[model samples]
Target chain A: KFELPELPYAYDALEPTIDKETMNIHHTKHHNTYVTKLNGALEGHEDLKNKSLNDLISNLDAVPENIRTAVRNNGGGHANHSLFWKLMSPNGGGKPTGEVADKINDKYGSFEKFQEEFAAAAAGRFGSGWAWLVVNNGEIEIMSTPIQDNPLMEGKKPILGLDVWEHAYYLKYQNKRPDYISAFWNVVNWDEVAAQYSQAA
Target chain B: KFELPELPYAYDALEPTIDKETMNIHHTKHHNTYVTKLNGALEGHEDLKNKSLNDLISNLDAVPENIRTAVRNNGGGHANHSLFWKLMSPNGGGKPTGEVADKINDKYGSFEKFQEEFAAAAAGRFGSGWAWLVVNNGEIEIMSTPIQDNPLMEGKKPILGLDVWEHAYYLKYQNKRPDYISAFWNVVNWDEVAAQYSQAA
Candidate 1:
């Protein structure tokens, strides 16, 4: 059975915008349930257990419908969050350096433009989904996907992700997602992002 | 008339994972295109101008088909990406704190569990969509939504977001969404998330 991954920082660490109470409930009750259920769904499916989380996400057709949603949801929860945990740091956010920065200038004409475009994607998504920064064919692109659909499922390589789920901010921003978006820059983990860029490049 | 927003930090800020090259193109070419097209679609629609982005997203039925897809696509692109920009930062990602963290423990039992569930949602979505962490009524729930369909449109508020779109990654992870999902945490702007929590609460 798949289990939840531990977070590096305490739940209260992301305070102010994301309340510790909300984080506790979100991580423990909600996320745990998904893992439990996902495990139950995959109980007899050894093939699935052996497959990587990415494989299961991309090959949804192979899983049985009864457990397909389970796998997608729980598996997605497991995968999305696992990465989310690593992406952050107590001392995250600030700015990028090296090649990543140069690329931003080259591709977007300026970092200011990049911010606008990425912010636009985050704000523009109609429903619950994600906005992403991806490197494709040696180029960077911004794209949005609804629900659990990940860029990797389509043969793309994702470098960065933003979580647009209501629970992700409802407790803090309420109806003003834009406000929440604006504040996100204050705590980004540039180091990790830089590493991802290096890995991809 | 609308243009892409500027990056709060320098282009070199989020190095490695997001190279300056990728950021430049993603913003200038991709996000700019969406903004331009979205404005074009809304040019003659008087009623639409009066509505908020949330309203436009929720009331997709009222938009003209000729521009409906455009609104859903480019409009969605514009809105989602707009939010995405704000959701991130040169200084983000760490952990949740305060009431939000406590609640996470109460609901899911642990932060690790929460991550599992979120990851499942992000990875489980059937196609191009998103995995959300939403607050319904007073309780925090994690759910998934398909392309351009957000809980806000359903009267549910959004605080956080992630982009699972192919363009979000493609070049970096290529068919390896889980890897991308894992990487997101590094750059998450938790402070903004904290601010959102305060407002939502």
Candidate 2:
């Protein structure tokens, strides 16, 4: 079974950007629960257990109908959060460089425009969820989803994601989501994003 | 012209029952924003503005369709938070007494059963929303609503409610909603609950 990926940096490495307590609890407590619940949901399903996490999630219909919702939620939680860790860095933030930079400019007009659009997506999401920048057939698109859902569930590939769930920001920003979102922009791993962008492009 | 109410107690008075920061923001920021937005949503509508907040929320369908969603959300938010404040007391917690107790025991078998069912409603609420102990007609019922919705919109009378939104508990509870729900019991104003119960019943 898949396990919680160790967060790439120390809990407080992100510092004033993302607090130590939020990072520590988010990694150890929140993500850990999702993985454990996902494992529990897949227990005794030998055929499904052997499948890769990607395969298990991307082909969710094959799972029994009873456990499908469980898999979709906890499984998606597992998948989304796993990717989420790499999308940030302690030494991260600033605009993308290279192909990803050019693509964002080409698609959304400018990095500033892209940031505005992405922030709008994150801010406009009504409930607990995530906002994403995904590569859809060589084009970059912005989207949001509720709960642990991800773009993969809709057959798309996300290059970057920002968790807008209150748990992601409440401790630090309270209900000031825009502030948390601003902090997110300061910690995003544009290098990781560039890699995903080039592969998908 | 509707204004946010003064909190009945000092923000920190809720203390370990609810963190000072959460209460401070929940009232001054979260609830305040709802009031501001509800005022904005109700602006230019003389008929609705003159109507009671309860009446305006209860008949959301009568609101101009253009601003109906805004009123349903912000107006409902205004209504819910107004009650939520009065429903908590520093000297609160423990079981009810008198007529309310008899009705609760008669209907739900016991106070413990009611709590279990209420907790289920709270924890099971899928996203941002509330869990309510309402009196519909003459009997008590447990119900949950998404976003800013409440029993009033459905024509039921709520005796007590707990805000289960991540903003309500995420600061202290993190991913552990059950813990927040448990703590909620520590400060719920049984006196106010009993009053509302008698009125609604």
Candidate 3:
């Protein structure tokens, strides 16, 4: 059964970048609900119950049709947030490092341009969704997913993702999603991104 | 050009049902953005610019493919929020009356049953969306739509709608969308619903 993962740092660690209240509610309320619901969805399905969250999301067709939607929505949510928590840190931010930096620079010219393109993708998503940096066929690709959809479902390996759902920033930024996108850079754990990028590459 | 409609009641009119902060931002920020974007999408299309908000959403195929998505999302948002404001009241709630009451009793057995069905539809919506009571072929049909999709897009006339989007309730209700659904019952302006029902009927 899926369980909610704890944040790597204190709830307030991302303060100013992401508020303590928002983080607490986002994790305890939103993310926890996804975990609980995902577990409930797996009930009576022993085979699926033992599978990794990534496998469940990546191969949703294997899920029973009756429970497929529940798993897709909640299971995708669980996996998304689990990755989301690790991809931000108190001592993080500045820019990509290691191979991730080299790749981003190679693809987008400069980190600044990559940031603009990524921010634009996040901002341009009209409704609840996420912006992602994924490795597709050993190359870095930027994409957005609607609702709680995971990139793995599309055969892309997500290295980093920015959740653009209203619940992510409504408390601090309200409807100004671009501002929230800008603030995300301050706490982004580029180290984790680099590690994930290396694995995907 | 499409424009944001003023809320019929004061920002605080819905009070504890829908907080002033939520209502204000929902109106001035979210809904206003939709209006502004819809107008921008129609900037050079004189033919589209003259059409009613409802017309644009209902016949999206007529719109150029380039701007169709933008018009559908933002135009739908403008229309949905316009009706949403009038559907609630500080002085509303209790039970359906007049033709709406008769139809509720006839179709669902009682107002209680109808309320349950409506709330269930709203609560069951997995992501950002709306649950609507629409007049479909002269009968009340309860359905949910993803994102800013309006019922008119499917030829149904929306008589009542509850926005289950996180933005609609996150400030006051957070992850408790069911609680928000319950509060909505207390503020529903059944009078407006009846009027819309009469016209659709």
Candidate 4:
């Protein structure tokens, strides 16, 4: 039985940048639904039931044809939202200051240019998806994946990602996705990101 | 300037089925932004600026490189939403009658099966997109397409389709997309579908 992870912080922790109500609903309602459905999708697959969500989604082709989509969609949602909660902070924002920061600068010329590239990926995604700063070929690269697909699907590791799904920002930002993208910078957890980079190294 | 079209019916017309607030934001905010962005993408292309939306999308190769994505995403939104407004009615639902009804029965055994298939498409859609009952290769079939893509992209046309984007149902139904899809039947304009079928046939 897949369970929704306890959120890392209070619902309103990331606010003023990411409003509290959106957080509440996004977690309590949105994330919980995916958790429930993904668990349901695993029914009868006794051998698979104990598998980690990351394992299930990582090997999606092996999931039963009937429930593959359910696992893929809901499992992806489960994993995505699980990670989304930890990537923000009220004290976060601004540029990185260490190895990750240096790598970003080396690859994209500067953090400012990196933001422009990642922002393009976020805004350019045509539909519900995520923009990722992934480690591909051991190089820091930016990519966007549609729907629940993540860097894992491509044999890469995501260091940081942003959900551009309409539900993520529709309530507060309406259709001004650019505004939401801009606001994202103000709440990004640089500490967590550096930790991911540390793990990769 | 690309303008937002006045909805064919009052905001409250689709109430109980699709709430007034969703309709208001979907049309006024979601749809309008697309219109604005599509127009912005056309800023310097006088030759393409005056082209029909269908023509632009069908032959996206003619559009300039830098703004093609902008045009495709925004233009698709503008066109899709314009048609979506006409496809639902306050006095809608039930079965289609006459030629279209016969064709549906012949193709899928019954409208209920069609609904099941379409409902699957709607709910099964990985993320933001549309579920369509389209006339493809002279057969009635249900399919789902990502983002703002439509049957036109496949050299076919849709007789009936529903927006499955989270924004379409998230506000009213939250993550229970099945509920929103069920309620969709309450406001579906069979008459408009019949008309589109007649034209396609």
Instruction: Identify the candidate with maximal DockQ.
Output: 3
lDDT per model, in order? 0.71, 0.86, 0.89, 0.84
Which pairs clash in model 4? Answer: none
Where does candidate 4 chain B have its weakest 10-residue lDDT segment?
B150-159
Candidate 1, residue A94: how far the Cα is off, in Å: 0.7
lDDT of 4 at B162: 86
DockQ of predictions, in order shown: 0.07, 0.65, 0.74, 0.56
Point out the worst 10-residue segment of candidate 3 chain B by lDDT. Answer: B1-10
DockQ of 2: 0.65
> What would the per-residue lDDT of candidate 1 be over residues A9-101, giving only the tens digit for each residue?
898887865677766766786567667877788788888878777787778888988778777766766666566666656677766666878
Evaluate residue B130 in candidate 4 and report its C-alpha lDDT on the 0 to 100 scale: 86
Better of 2 and 3 by TM-score: 3
Residue B168 of model 2 has an lDDT of 90
Model 2 misplacement above 4 A: A63-65
Structural similarity to truth (TM-score) of each candidate: 0.53, 0.92, 0.98, 0.85
Please provide, for model 1 over B51-131, each residue's C-alpha lDDT reduced to its tens digit, 9 standing for 90 to 100: 777678778889988788887777666776676667666676666666777777888899778877887788876545666
Question: Residue A92 error for model 1, in Å?
Answer: 1.4
Fnat, one value per model: 0.12, 0.75, 0.62, 0.62
Summarize candidate 2's per-residue lDDT along A112-154 as a digit string, tens digits.
9999999999998876789999888878789998878888888
Q: Provide the lDDT at B196 for model 4.
A: 87
lDDT of 2 by residue, B132-154 (tens): 98787877788998878878999
Query: Once superposed on the true structure, which residue ranges of model 3 sit more than 4 Å away at CA?
Result: none
